[PDB]
Design a protein around this ligand. Structure first.
Ligand SMILES: [Zn+2]
Ligand SMILES: [Zn+2]
Ligand SMILES: [Zn+2]
Lengths: 49, 64, 48, 214, 511, 102, 48
RNA sequence: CCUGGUGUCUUGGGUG
DNA sequence: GGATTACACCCAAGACACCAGGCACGAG
DNA sequence: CTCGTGCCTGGTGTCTTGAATCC
């Protein structure tokens, strides 16, 4: 899904479709951030919560 | 107009490198080498085509 | 054959710069045409 | 006293010169040949000495009175960089250029060669002459299991077990001392001689595993 | 025989005893390709086995080497490597056999060869297009440049055929800009452009009147003479040979401080060799270079005077095709020097032991064998450590999809200009391609117009010695260059043999 | 190559066997020794190769205490020490051993 | 010489296209892929 | 008795 | 002095060197 | 049985000099 296909979906105004293609249908990832310093420096043990 | 140029030549006497300054006066066809360290001076004739390497060459032969 | 093969990349570069220049330009609900900074480019789209 | 031999302004100068890595000893050699060959001729090589320190890779130092002699010493030498890169050393830096510089029984060292490479060992004793040291080592043995070794295909470390050797594959020599496959094991440890140059005595860092064991 | 001897020396003081160690390379002998198993057994290798077992179809090469030992108080057939053999050539085991036995060797009689086998893969060499050597070309320069016309030549020897150096003559001064419109040249291994008159004087011809007699052969042409006017005055103060030669040496990339007593003698080498080496390199022949230099300046001004068009870079007569022969020689040359230095570096250690070296321990055949195999397998034309800057794609896997495709692939040519640089001139079908390369067959895409294919009746010159041609020209009336004067010879024709001006003849029509 | 522990000179080992040490052999007698003796007085392990061309006027030579010796190759550091029995014999000869091992 | 070499390695670790000096090379002979080169061009992190 | 990893960097030749 | 130079796709074809040290085998 | 030489494996470390237009 190259740069030129990205532009076509903008022209159609299909913003919802473009988001899904580039996330859920590919390499979607969850990260944690610190609300104070804004870095991805959070150490998250999910079973210990 | 005179040309005052710094060079990367080594003085034949004090051995300090990058301390020889060349003043080429083409209006009178007189070139001048100067040492920014030990303070010596050497004079030699220059043409219109000469460059700091031309008089510094003449200084090597004037010693030997 | 040379012309078609050469000048296709000339126009391909043209289209790429045009898209990046204009991609963020949107019609807003007041009829103005604006970019992402909210600068007004036209007070009414296409003047009509 | 060494303090009376310090250099003065009356002593020759010392220049450093950049040379091809690994070719420093060769350049020192070549300079000596040139010096000796020209002694007594009308064009002697006017250098006094030249040397190269291992700690100072890629450099040779040359002792003389005039810079021109340095250029003369190196002329045509294929191991020397042609750029006019020599540098002057200060008199106050001379002796440090010539600084020459452990191991005690009961201390630990790390082995540098063989299947025991990287292993911690106790220094048991050294040879009379002074070259190889007897080391006490946790063995890496198979009890002849697949006989009819390298450091990449060796065995895990485990104390020698003489009853296992008795069962599976051995000469008793003393209390707790066995010779097994021509190596000596005393109270479970290998005692084996290594060249001193084959052990590391400095800056050893015990590992987690070594703290657990020793 | 390009560098036929290795020489060492030590002035024994350890009763001085100069002991020169010398090694001389002699005759070359070739053997048919042989498979040597890990066993040690050998047999003749035929291609079908070589394809199947991913072997290289190559011949062992043996070289005579001779030792000699000068001592003054004051070998045999060593193996140097394997060379891949082109199938169906004279050194391939299939060249004989005859149709009956070809079928037994599993070889197809329609297979015409022309390719190599490297690790089981069939590799064909692609003809490389280059500009001719030893020819003068004049081009015009773009507007924002002080130069308006440039003459250029890349000089290359006849023996071997290999590149040496490149030389340029630039005409400065724009249209009514550039004031004094003088001419300076560019010399190999000299940092700055040197005016023409200075190099004329530096070769041994110093008074003005002789200089102009070497360039312009028409005393009436005042337009041409007016353009050489500023060149005389900007090089007037250099009035003799010695100060001319020293003016050169003070720029030629050397060290600082070689004094006038020797800086002349260093520049005399840069003039005798490297500058126009295709004419001659022996001493006492500077008359040929001075006469040739005048010809160049003459050609330069004809284009600047708009009496002759600038040269057309795409004219096919100014082009050459490097095929399998020349391409291998250039690669073999580079690798044989590499083998040579490893022998030299090995003697300096093995003679300090004062032990007779067994020769076979001082020739590592991996240098040539791995060198040729690697370059033929990847197409990277150079030493492996220098894979960039080297030319790529000279060797390619032979396309065997269909029979027609095999014929086309073996007759392909390549121009190595790039994909960088748009325009059209190297890509266009030029008029002079008629009958020499196909007007129809060219790839689509990025290579379009740069990769070409030889027409059906084309051939490529194998090369011929120029020496018999000289003998024929002098026998039928050609007059030497020392007998030539533009006042007496205001009408005779100049004669060139491989780009060097060698003589003049007054009646060319019969000749 | 080995280095003499007494004077620091660097020579091919066989030289120590053939001719003895050129600086030391008046007291060390390596010429007339066995290989065990040569190997106790000379070391295969040394560092800092020094070309001494002019012993008597070199500061480098004076620092290394080779200024009274012959021109040649010397080592800054020689590993090992002379055996105590040989040190004792040298001392009987009025020779004082100053170790060159650092 | 040793401090300048630490400066060198830290520089070509981030950018190995420094103008006016030779590139850091792998033992294979090809240039080291620095972080700057990871992000630029058609195949890098942003366009690719 | 559910989970289940096979390379990269180039170069060259091709397709629209 | 650098940076710019269409898009996507297919497939076949390749890979560190030298020196030193240690161990094993053969010959005296 | 001992010594020397050759081969293999592991560890550490580079260098003889030799495509064109624009801002
Ligand atoms: Zn935070
Ligand atoms: Zn001075
Ligand atoms: Zn001694």
């Amino acid at each position: 899904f190259g740069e030129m296909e990205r532009d076509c979906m903008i022209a159609h105004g299909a913003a919802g479709f473009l988001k899904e293609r580039l996330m859920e249908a590919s390499d979607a990832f969850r990260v944690h951030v610190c609300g104070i310093c804004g870095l991805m420096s959070v150490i998250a043990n999910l079973k210990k919560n | 107009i005179k040309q005052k140029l710094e060079t990367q030549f080594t003085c034949l006497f004090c051995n300090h490198d990058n301390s020889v300054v060349c003043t080429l006066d083409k209006k009178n066809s007189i070139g001048l080498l100067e040492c920014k360290k030990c303070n010596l001076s050497f004079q030699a004739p220059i043409n219109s085509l000469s460059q700091p390497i031309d008089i510094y060459s003449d200084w090597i032969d004037a010693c030997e | 054959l040379i012309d078609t093969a050469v000048k296709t990349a000339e126009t391909g570069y043209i289209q790429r710069r045009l898209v990046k220049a204009l991609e963020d330009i949107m019609v807003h609900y007041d009829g103005t045409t604006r970019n992402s900074l909210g600068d007004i480019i036209q007070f009414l789209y296409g003047e009509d | 006293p060494q303090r009376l031999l310090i250099p003065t302004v009356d002593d020759p100068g010392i220049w450093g010169v950049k040379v091809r890595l690994g070719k420093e000893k060769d350049v020192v050699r070549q300079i000596l040949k040139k010096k000796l060959a020209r002694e007594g001729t009308k064009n002697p090589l006017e250098i006094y000495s030249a040397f190269q320190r291992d700690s100072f890779k890629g450099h040779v130092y040359i002792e003389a009175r005039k810079a021109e002699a340095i250029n003369d010493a190196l002329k045509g030498n294929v191991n020397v960089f042609s750029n006019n890169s020599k540098f002057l050393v200060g008199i106050v830096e001379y002796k440090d250029l010539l600084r020459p510089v452990k191991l005690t029984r009961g201390s630990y060292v790390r082995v540098k060669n063989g299947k025991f490479k990287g292993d911690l060992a106790q220094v048991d004793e050294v040879l009379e002459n002074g070259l190889e040291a007897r080391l006490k080592l946790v063995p890496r043995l198979d009890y002849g299991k697949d006989l009819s070794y390298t450091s990449k295909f060796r065995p895990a470390q485990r104390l020698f077990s003489e009853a296992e050797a008795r069962v599976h594959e051995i000469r008793r020599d003393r209390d707790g001392f066995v010779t097994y496959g021509g190596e000596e094991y005393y109270e479970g440890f290998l005692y084996k001689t290594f060249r001193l140059q084959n052990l590391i005595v400095n800056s050893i860092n015990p590992t987690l595993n070594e703290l657990s064991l020793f | 025989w390009e560098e036929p001897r290795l020489i060492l020396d030590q002035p024994a003081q350890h009763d001085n005893i100069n002991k020169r160690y010398e090694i001389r390379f002699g005759k070359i002998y070739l053997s048919r390709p042989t498979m040597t198993e890990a066993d040690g057994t050998t047999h003749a290798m035929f291609p079908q086995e070589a394809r199947l077992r991913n072997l290289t179809y190559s011949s062992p090469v043996y070289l005579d080497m001779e030792k000699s030992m000068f001592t003054s108080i004051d070998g045999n057939k060593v193996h140097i490597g394997k060379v891949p053999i082109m199938l169906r050539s004279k050194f391939c085991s299939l060249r004989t056999l005859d149709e009956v036995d070809l079928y037994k060797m599993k070889e197809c009689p329609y297979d015409m060869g022309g390719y190599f086998v490297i690790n089981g893969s069939e590799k064909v060499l692609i003809a490389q297009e280059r500009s001719a050597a030893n020819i003068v070309q004049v081009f015009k320069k773009a507007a924002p440049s002080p130069i308006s016309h440039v003459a250029e030549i890349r000089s290359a020897l006849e023996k071997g055929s290999r590149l040496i150096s490149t030389m340029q003559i630039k005409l400065y001064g724009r249209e009514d800009k550039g004031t004094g419109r003088t001419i300076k040249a560019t010399l190999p291994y000299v940092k700055q452009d040197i005016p023409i008159v200075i190099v004329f004087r530096a070769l041994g011809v110093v008074p003005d009147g002789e200089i102009l007699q070497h360039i312009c052969y028409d005393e009436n042409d005042w337009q041409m003479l007016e353009m050489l006017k500023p060149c005389i005055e900007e090089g007037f103060v250099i009035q003799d040979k010695e100060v001319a030669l020293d003016f050169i040496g003070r720029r030629g990339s050397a060290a600082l401080g070689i004094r006038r007593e020797k800086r002349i003698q260093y520049a005399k080498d840069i003039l005798q060799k490297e500058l126009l080496p295709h004419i001659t390199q022996e001493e006492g022949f500077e008359t040929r270079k001075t006469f040739f230099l005048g010809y160049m300046v003459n050609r330069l001004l004809l284009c600047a005077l708009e009496r002759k068009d600038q040269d057309d870079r795409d004219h096919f007569g100014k082009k050459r095709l490097d095929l399998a022969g020349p391409l291998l020689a250039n690669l073999f040359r580079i690798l044989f020097r590499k083998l040579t230095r490893e022998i030299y570096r090995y003697m300096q250690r093995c003679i300090e032991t004062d032990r007779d070296f067994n020769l076979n321990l001082a020739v590592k055949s991996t240098t040539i064998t791995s060198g040729l195999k690697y370059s033929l397998a990847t197409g990277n034309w150079g030493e492996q450590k220098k894979a960039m800057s080297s030319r790529a794609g000279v060797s390619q896997v032979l396309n065997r999809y269909t029979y027609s495709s095999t014929l086309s692939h073996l007759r392909r040519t390549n121009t190595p200009i790039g994909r960088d640089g748009k325009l059209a001139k190297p890509r266009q079908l030029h008029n002079t391609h008629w009958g020499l390369v196909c007007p129809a067959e060219t790839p689509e895409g990025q290579a379009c117009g740069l990769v070409k294919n030889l027409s059906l009746l084309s051939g490529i010159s194998i090369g011929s010695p120029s020496e018999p041609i000289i003998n024929f020209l002098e026998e039928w009336g050609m007059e030497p260059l020392e007998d030539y004067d533009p006042a007496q010879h205001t009408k005779s024709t100049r004669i060139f043999v491989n780009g060097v001006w060698t003589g003049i003849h007054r009646d060319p029509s019969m000749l | 190559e080995r280095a003499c522990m007494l004077c620091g000179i660097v020579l091919p080992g066989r030289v120590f066997m053939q001719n003895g040490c050129p600086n030391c052999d008046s007291v060390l007698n390596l010429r007339d020794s066995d290989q065990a003796t040569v190997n106790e007085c000379t070391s295969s392990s040394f560092e800092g190769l020094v070309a001494v061309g002019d012993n008597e006027h070199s500061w480098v030579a004076k620092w290394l205490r080779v200024d009274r010796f012959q021109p040649g190759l010397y080592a800054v550091r020689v590993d090992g020490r002379l055996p105590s029995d040989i040190v004792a014999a040298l001392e009987q000869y009025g020779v004082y051993y100053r170790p060159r091992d650092g | 010489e040793v401090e300048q070499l630490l400066q060198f390695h830290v520089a070509t670790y981030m950018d190995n296209d420094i103008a006016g000096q030779p590139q850091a090379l792998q033992k294979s002979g090809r240039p080291v892929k620095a972080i700057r080169a990871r992000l630029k061009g058609k195949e890098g992190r942003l366009r690719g």
